[PDB]
Amino acid sequence: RVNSDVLTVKPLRDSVKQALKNYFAQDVNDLYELVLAEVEQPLLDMVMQYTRGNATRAALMMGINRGTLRKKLKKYGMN
Template sequence: MPENLIDKKFLVNFTKDNQNKVIKKPLRLLVKKSLENYLLNLDNTKYINNLYPLILSELEQPLLDVIMQYTRGNQTKAALMMGINRSTLRKKLKKYGMN
């Protein structure tokens, strides 16, 4: 799906500061901050070679969970919403033990 057709205004987290003022934080900023925090607290003696699949799994599993709840378990609707093939969805559900 072309990126310009996706409405990103809902991919935002709303929080309040000390003065009770609403702060909007885009999802990508929250992901970035989490990744920065992970790297800052990383033990320098360890070599990382699986960061990409680690990050994907941290995002993919909750995405699948929420979409499957939203579609009430309808894999066809879920696959269409996610823009992936139904068989790919089934593989991903199996990967996370969600089948």
């Protein structure tokens, strides 16, 4: 049913659901971007700490190329 259960905070998906439930409880036209930004930022931050700042190693671990990683970091002013 679900891809993996290695991300736990108690799956991370449950935290996403609760956040959305509380979000809906309080019109929208950018919910995907809203969520994507909220998840990419901490992901990039944690991956860069794990690879001690090595951008190539972070891209490899993420499964994306260096240019894509640079673009994302840039987007969040993490460059």
